[PDB]
Amino acid sequence: DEPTSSTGALTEFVKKMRATARKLTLPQGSRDWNSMAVRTRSYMEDLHL
Amino acid sequence: TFNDVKTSLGITESYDIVNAIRNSQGDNFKSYVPLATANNVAEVGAGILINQTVQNDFITSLVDRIGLVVIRQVSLNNPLKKFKKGQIPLGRTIEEIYTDITKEKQYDAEEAEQKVFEREMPNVKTLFHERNRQGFYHQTIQDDSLKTAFVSWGNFESFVSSIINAIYNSAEVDEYEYMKLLVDNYYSKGLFTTVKIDEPTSSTGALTEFVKKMRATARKLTLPQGSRDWNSMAVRTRSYMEDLHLIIDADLEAELDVDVLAKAFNMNRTDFLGNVTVIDGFASTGLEAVLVDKDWFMVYDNLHKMETVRNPRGLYWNYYYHVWQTLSVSRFANAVAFVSGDVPAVTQVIVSPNIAAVKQGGQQQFTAYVRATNAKDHKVVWSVEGGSTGTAITGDGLLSVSGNEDNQLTVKATVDIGTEDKPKLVVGEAVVSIR
Amino acid sequence: IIDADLEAELDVDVLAKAFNMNRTDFLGNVTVIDGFASTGLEAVLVDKDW
Amino acid sequence: DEPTSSTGALTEFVKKMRATARKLTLPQGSRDWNSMAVRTRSYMEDLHL
Secondary structure, X not given: OOOOOOOOHHHHHHHHXXXXXXXXXXXXXXXXXXXXXXXXXXXXXXXXX | OOOOOOOOOOOOOOOOHHHHHXXXXXXXXXXXXXXXXXXXXXXXXXXXXXOOXXXXXXXXXXXXXXXXXXXXXXXXXXXXXXXXXXXXXXOOOEEEEEEOOOOOOOOOHHHHHHHOOOOOOOOEEEEEEOOOEXXXXXXXEOOOHHHHHOOOHHHHHHHHHHHHHHHHHHHXXXXXHHHHHHHHHHHHOOOOEEEEOOOOOOOHHHHXXXXXXXXXXXXXXXXOXXXXXXXXXXXXXXXXXXXXXXOOEHHHHHHHHHHHHOOOOOHHHOOOOOEXXXXXXXXXXXXXXXXXXXXXXXXXXXXXXXXEEEEHHHXXXXXXXXXXXXXXXXXXXXXXXXXXXXXXXXXXXXXXXXXXXXXXXXXXXXXXEEEEOOOOOOOOEEEXXXXXXXXXXXXXXXXXXXXXXXXXXXXXXEEEEOOOOOOEEEEEEEEEEEO | OEEHHHHHHHHHHHHOOOOOHXXXXXXXXXXXXXXXXXXXXXXXXXXXXX | OOOOOOOOOOOHHHHHHHHXXXXXXXXXXXXXXXXXXXXXXXXXXXXXX
16 A cells, blocks of 8 residues: 555555565465466575565 | 567566666666666566577577576475374274263152162263375376486486475375365364354454454363363363464464554463464355364374386386375364354254164153354254154153154254244254164 | 453453553452353352352 | 655654665665765764764
């Protein structure tokens, strides 16, 4: 919702972002979040924002 | 072996960045104007899919080569592995025995006079499990034809090993998936005690209500006096807080952290009780969360073998990784579902002494536990079938078997749902052997 | 003596979001139970001699 | 002067102040922070307010 517009948008940003970050590191892997639609998995220390 | 190899094969542009830069009016693309090879960088910024042969810019007839090959490897692992109970090397069926508690009797020495040796069996319930998964993974490696795609053994070899690694990853992924299947399965059969919840996420009020219901439930599950209300077997039992596992998912824990834990100061008063292990959600409609005992997961290994065979004629290897295992659920373990949306008025009628052996002409008491999802009253209609004249249930669970009975009996506990205009119902059931 | 459900209401909504929990806690002792039969009964406060 | 509507108008200057201060310390060192329009770079310990 574009943070700089209304407070709370930041909190929604944070939610979405943190949730996504979690998803990106789930042990079993996932086939989302990449342009090759391949199943993969990352690590938080290997993940940059 | 392809023609018309456009560089943007799978591209769905949102905008033409080249023209965006080209037409910068002092807007935010102006910082790329100082760049010189930006257009070329952009052209293949995301890499390419179909390799197109590229000739050397100086010689032209001389062709440019692949200078580096990077083989990437991912390790996938089953989160739920921690719930694996063990390994069964032989034999098939697994049996659980749960000795339940009993009904006290009113004191009366006048009856005791004659009933000293009256005997009474313990309320013991049992549950069986069978080996279920027996799948395998199949990969083919044409390791002679593959030689043409490499120029070194390091690359060739590591590639091959990657394929095998993929087999193991496959196993981990699917094992995980099967365990989720058990949850959705058990749910689909109406075997969880359903906590109806307002849909979480949609509001912080809903989220909060969810949390309250969660902690309250977790509390109930561990109370000393025990409870029958969390078991499909309706046995009274007790869980330990450290043995409770709440699954939920990443979406939910994010909201918990952001809306609740950052804004609270006394975190422990809102934290989820027991252990929490997020996953990728559940597929059952509305199944938002599952709270179960660590011993709910009846999971045992039965077989893990990789065998191979080469096809002379075809010059290739087949890899067969067999994975057998017992995947089940203990109905003696406490199990709770948090379900959004609408649920049935009653999800399950549990009739007790499932297996009886009434002496012909005798009788048997059947209790019943109606898993209501609400505070409404639900009268139970008892019914007996498969028997003959004089065999009937009086209601309130008392089965009266006729002296001439000889057929296996079915005892039912019907709970009506809705109006008589195509009324619905749930049937609990127990069976009786006639001695 | 309190139904776990009510206990949680306090816990989550009130004890959290407070700097001085001692101004919101329940007076007397608290014994959490599975609940009570009879519509509307949430918690019971009694003297030890009850 | 104008933070924008939606709460905000209590930290609007705080955010701009801190943001700007960070911009002057970006490693790549931008222009637009000095009257000579030169690429340059400041350090937090060298900034004064």
